[PDB]
Ligand binder design. Sequence first.
Ligand code: AGS
Ligand code: MG
Lengths: 190, 191, 369, 180, 172
Amino acid sequence: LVPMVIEQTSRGERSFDIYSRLLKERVIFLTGQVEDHMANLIVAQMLFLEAENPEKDIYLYINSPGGVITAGMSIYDTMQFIKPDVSTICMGQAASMGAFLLTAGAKGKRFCLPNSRVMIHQPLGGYQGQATDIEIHAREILKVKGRMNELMALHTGQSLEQIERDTERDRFLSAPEAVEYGLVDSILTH
Amino acid sequence: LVPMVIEQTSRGERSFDIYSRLLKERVIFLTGQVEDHMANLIVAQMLFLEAENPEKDIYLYINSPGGVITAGMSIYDTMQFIKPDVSTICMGQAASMGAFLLTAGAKGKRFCLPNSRVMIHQPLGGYQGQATDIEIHAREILKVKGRMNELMALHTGQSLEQIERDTERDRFLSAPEAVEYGLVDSILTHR
Amino acid sequence: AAVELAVKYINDRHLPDKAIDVIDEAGARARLMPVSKRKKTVNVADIESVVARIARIPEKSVSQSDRDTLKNLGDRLKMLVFGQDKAIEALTEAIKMARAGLGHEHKPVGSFLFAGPTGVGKTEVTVQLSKALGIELLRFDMSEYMERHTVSRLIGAPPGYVGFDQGGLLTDAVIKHPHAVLLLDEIEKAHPDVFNILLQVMDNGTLTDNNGRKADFRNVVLVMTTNAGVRETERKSIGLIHQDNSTDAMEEIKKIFTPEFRNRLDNIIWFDHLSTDVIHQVVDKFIVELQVQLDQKGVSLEVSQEARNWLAEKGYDRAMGARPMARVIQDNLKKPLANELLFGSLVDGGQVTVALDKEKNELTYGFQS
Amino acid sequence: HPDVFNILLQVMDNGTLTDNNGRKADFRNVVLVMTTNAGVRETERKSIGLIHQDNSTDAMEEIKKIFTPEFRNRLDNIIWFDHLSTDVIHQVVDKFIVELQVQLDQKGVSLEVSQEARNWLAEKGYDRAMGARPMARVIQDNLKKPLANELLFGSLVDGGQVTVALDKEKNELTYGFQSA
Amino acid sequence: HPDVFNILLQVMDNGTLTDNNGRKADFRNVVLVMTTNTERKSIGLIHQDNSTMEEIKKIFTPEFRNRLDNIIWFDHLSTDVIHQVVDKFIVELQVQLDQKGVSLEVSQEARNWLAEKGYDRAMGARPMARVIQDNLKKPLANELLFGSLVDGGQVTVALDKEKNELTYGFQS
Ligand SMILES: Nc1ncnc2c1ncn2[C@@H]1O[C@H](COP(=O)(O)OP(=O)(O)OP(O)(O)=S)[C@@H](O)[C@H]1O
Ligand SMILES: [Mg+2]
């Protein structure tokens, strides 16, 4: 159940869901494992907000533990295309795709909470079967990692060699240390 | 839970969901595995938008990981039958059935985002039973894959032989490669 | 001429009586006419003037003073209503056609629907037209008719009811003022059933009240300003790929108005958003009005060119139009002068001036005596 | 109001209407003609499907839902007016021009319109939904507006033969004014 | 109701209204004043304060606000100001009581309790009038008429900390 909040208007009060009223204020929330339906839902919200206002920033709260990589790419390609800068405020955990989504955020508007934690590791698409088919599948995952790492380094600016070395094994970064690494430009506290 | 997106009109405020609000602008959404029940919904949206404005261009966002082949044919035939040109913008992923719909989009209106992918492969339909039933069933699946190459070749413009050779083993594609391969025409213009 | 003109214009009397009085009224007018012995004969020109007075309608043959006024009617209006030239063109052409004699014998002089963004000058052009032509303006606010049963005041209540004796407003107004301008502001706000009355008004130029009397709308200009246009000015599409939106725009009015009502409209004028250059002219008009009011007391106000440009930009609004300019002109220019005029140097002020300081970012009001 | 339709029932069947004072009217020699617009909207509707549909019967079904059966059962006939075709619209242009000439006859100016110009006017103003009303407006803008400016302030102040034609190169009307 | 706002819009825009009898109501010489502003306690386990530029924009359409000449704002009654407001009632009663011939010895000590009891943050000073109506008027009224203070009277006020009520002293 979602609480219904009335939004005062000159015509009169109209009841709306808590998420609905937040969307009216350019606030979009993200949570749960990334899914095609979930990714497409956040995509429709981004497009509607851009048409409503093409300048005001659209907030994007990421509190997800990671999900399918392919689903996440749709969100990333929709965020870059839209003219308004996305404010990727990380309010909690941020797995591989979680880190990728917040890093895609426009520079100068990315914020992080004091006690948030961003976990970055490599993608895992392990499949078992005939060696012939695995070759193409094996080639594909590296290409996504290379493409993601290339785009990731473009946003952050760190050396590609260092990023792959670190991303080979699971890495945990604190909110203070995250800004040092360049994941988030600033921290929001007050 | 679907978010609500209030709209303003002289008659009053017509509250609507996000999917229905975008549908008023001819933006159809194809999400998840294709199936007999979701295809019926997509074709229904195309028919309604066709009567409203024939001149306007429809927009289909394909973000599906593949589904039953039979359901996909219904969506493709509807798109070609309607006069309005269907613009297929690949978002996130384009599996065999998703790619088929992406190719079906009118020439000059097909676009692919920078990080989207396009995977094509041979049908994986299987049947178990008596040898006589398998023989007739085997003919149908072979006729379907072959039919797919002919229709795909028509839109893409490639030769039947290369498509058949390419589909022998699982293959993936990138966003710029799709334009070269003929699945689409050009990357979506940056705005 | 008398018999034909009377039936064409005089509709409240029968042919033998109305025709005979025209002849009798013409001779009587001729009796006091020979100030210089001009009593030779009564011609057709005299019959047209006497009938024009009985029915209170402009004479058939346009004079040479009425003719001169219609030549520069559009130019005279542009001096007070800047922009929207096509609106003036349609109004001026219709008035010229009806006087020349090419008008519709069973329809009003003009039936023009005005739409567009708020504050673009819809009621001003109508009010200025009435003042320019010396025509009594009949103003009916359609905001008092937000219910289906409000039409009882336009044509009157039926017999046997509380309002039978009082009569209708619109019918009596046109009967008292045969030659007038009809303005229905915010027509869309009115109930959809009020449009049905206007149908016969525009098609046959006749309306019947509860008393059986027929109102003549052939010599009245019907203008119905609406705010529908403001809704489609956004031209925004919720999609990854944008669209022109030209065809959908301006089609909402067809949904709220039956095609019957629109099919009999002479034209559907659209008011474009005020241009930035036009805002400067509007400021000059307001300042001129303030100067005239001040000139009655004897004070003379002078505004620097730089102040006008900054003042216009301060109150420039596309959505709200030039309505905000009234507030900023009152709050900034008029309010400082109120205290001085009542008690101060401006009691008998002369050669007053005003200006602005760029670094200060505010106005500078000076006074002299 | 639909209830008002009931008043006409006795008129169309008994042929008499009684007033407040008890006086009985006689409508035996009265041609009762009622004009309505009921099915125009339903016919304008467009089907939504692969195969299109016919909405000819929708026009009459709407009328049946507005007027009571006891009202329509005593009507002598229900004539369905049909949209004005391009051919009849051409004739309508001639009718309006004839009316314009009668107005112009009083002023003493005789207008002449070339057949080519008439066809051009018909195409510009031919709208099935709006019928013949736009023809008046098209003629009004093209012919009445220039004449009015000239009449009150130019060559046509006095009676003078005027002519109209069409420029094929520019596809626009050409007016010629003669003063005599 | 929104229809009533339209009526006021026509007034502020043209300065005239039309009666249902055909009359014309002249508004060109009327000062139009619109006043805008909860009694129920907070619906929570622990009660909380219910005290309440963008608020007007939300509750009023721009077409109505844009027609206003100037929107005047009124400030919440300060604690210091409240002491001045209660003084007006005491002096008002004094001039009223002067016609009878008595002088109230009341000082700021009495007004201290009356202030908090009379003034409420939400209700404001509306109960203030009722406070004097019963606390200060009713007790004196009975003694003034029984004959003790009819031919001239002297009154006073006494507030005890423990009693937490306003006592009175009568002399003549
Ligand atoms: N084009 C213009 N030229 C001159 N003055 C203008 C113009 N547009 C607006 N104004 C001024 O601003 C006022 C606007 O009020 P109206 O004439 O009623 O027009 P309006 O605000 O468009 O009408 P509504 O509100 O849409 S019925 C005018 O009376 C003028 O004082
Ligand atoms: Mg107005």
